[PDB]
UniProtKB/Swiss-Prot annotation:
Belongs to the plasmid partition ParM family. It comes from Escherichia coli. Homopolymerizes into double helical protofilaments with a longitudinal repeat similar to filamentous actin. This is Plasmid segregation protein ParM. GO terms for biological process: plasmid partitioning.
């Protein structure tokens, strides 16, 4: 049964429908270590035997995740993550069939032209003999593969002018792979690709300014403040002292300043923008960034509330 799993290296983003007739969205974080942290009681984990190795969930060190998007998206850690995501929602352990996501750097070349061997490479990854070490594993039978940024355009691209362009941006923890698509999917123009800076810099800098060590898996407590940067109420709760609120804000700002400092020039490098779509978790951050520089009018500037799930919705409506 088809589950749409945007298997991103920051966190995995999911959408599916069941036998009730209601559509569910879900998210499972990237937090899978190359060791077994077990549990025989209260404090409950997940543990896996992967390809031949020991894997489990704990609030992981940056070792695997702070590498590149490219390195993680085809990994054994990605195999843990996708099968973990279906267990964090809690689906009936049996089949899945999946849609999964590729970088644009990996999908499209020097001429920005495509590679299907990299499509089969994801399917080959999700062919490894993973056991849930306390249950059994969802069997991924059929596999569709898409790139990351592009499929978000799908539902909007329907009406959109076929000679004009839709510039589609994921800003992630890792991902900064960007596509210039054309309307109705008449073609694709130019791509840009990067994962050298992102929200992982921002969210980790907030941990330092708080009271928390530089791991991934306790990310929420810092991710909170990246979300509520437009507030001060949840900031006063979570950054629980006024004397720390500047420190956290200016640490966050140091990262965000230097994120803006590249991505605005990336949208100078992308000549021929006409419509803009902003997606991902950092969609909110690039909305605050790129709108004031690009100066495209709001009828051609797309970003919802959901932000990261905007991507997996465009994937969903292709075929379940
Ligand atoms: N509203 C928001 N404002 C700012 N950052 C956000 C927001 N929502 C999520 N994020 C953060 O953005 C990152 C996730 O980016 P995302 O694009 O969803 O992952 P990926 O790039 O792997 O696709 C996380 O650090 C997440 O906490
Ligand atoms: Mg992203």
């Amino acid at each position: 049964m088809l589950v749409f799993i945007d298997d991103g290296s920051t966190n995995i983003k999911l959408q599916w429908q069941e036998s009730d007739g209601t559509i569910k969205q879900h998210i499972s974080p990237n937090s899978f270590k190359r060791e077994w942290a077990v549990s025989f009681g209260d404090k409950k984990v997940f543990n896996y035997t992967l390809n031949g190795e020991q894997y489990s969930f704990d609030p992981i060190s940056p070792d695997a995740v702070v590498t590149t998007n490219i390195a993680w998206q085809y990994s054994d850690v990605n195999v843990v993550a996708v099968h973990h995501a279906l267990l964090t929602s809690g689906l009936p352990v049996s089949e899945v069939d999946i849609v999964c996501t590729l970088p644009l750097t990996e999908y499209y070349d020097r001429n920005n032209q495509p590679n299907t061997e990299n499509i089969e490479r994801k399917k080959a990854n999700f062919r490894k003999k993973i056991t849930l070490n306390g249950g059994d594993t969802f069997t991924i039978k059929d596999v569709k593969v898409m790139p990351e940024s592009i499929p978000a355009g799908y539902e909007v691209l329907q009406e959109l002018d076929e000679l004009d362009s839709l510039l589609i941006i994921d800003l992630g923890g890792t991902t900064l792979d960007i596509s210039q698509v054309m309307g109705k999917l008449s073609g694709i123009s130019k791509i840009y690709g990067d994962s050298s800076l992102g929200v992982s810099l921002v969210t980790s800098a907030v941990k330092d300014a708080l009271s928390l060590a530089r791991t991934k898996g306790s990310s929420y407590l810092a991710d909170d403040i990246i979300i509520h940067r437009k507030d001060n109420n949840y900031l006063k709760q979570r950054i629980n002292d006024e004397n720390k609120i500047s420190i956290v804000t200016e640490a966050m700002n140091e990262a965000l300043r230097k994120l803006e400092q590249r991505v605005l020039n990336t949208l100078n490098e992308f000549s021929g923008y006409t419509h803009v779509m902003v997606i991902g978790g950092g969609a909110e951050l690039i909305c605050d960034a790129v709108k004031k520089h690009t100066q495209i009018r709001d009828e051609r500037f797309f970003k919802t509330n959901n932000s990261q799930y905007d991507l997996v919705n465009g994937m969903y409506l292709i075929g379940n």
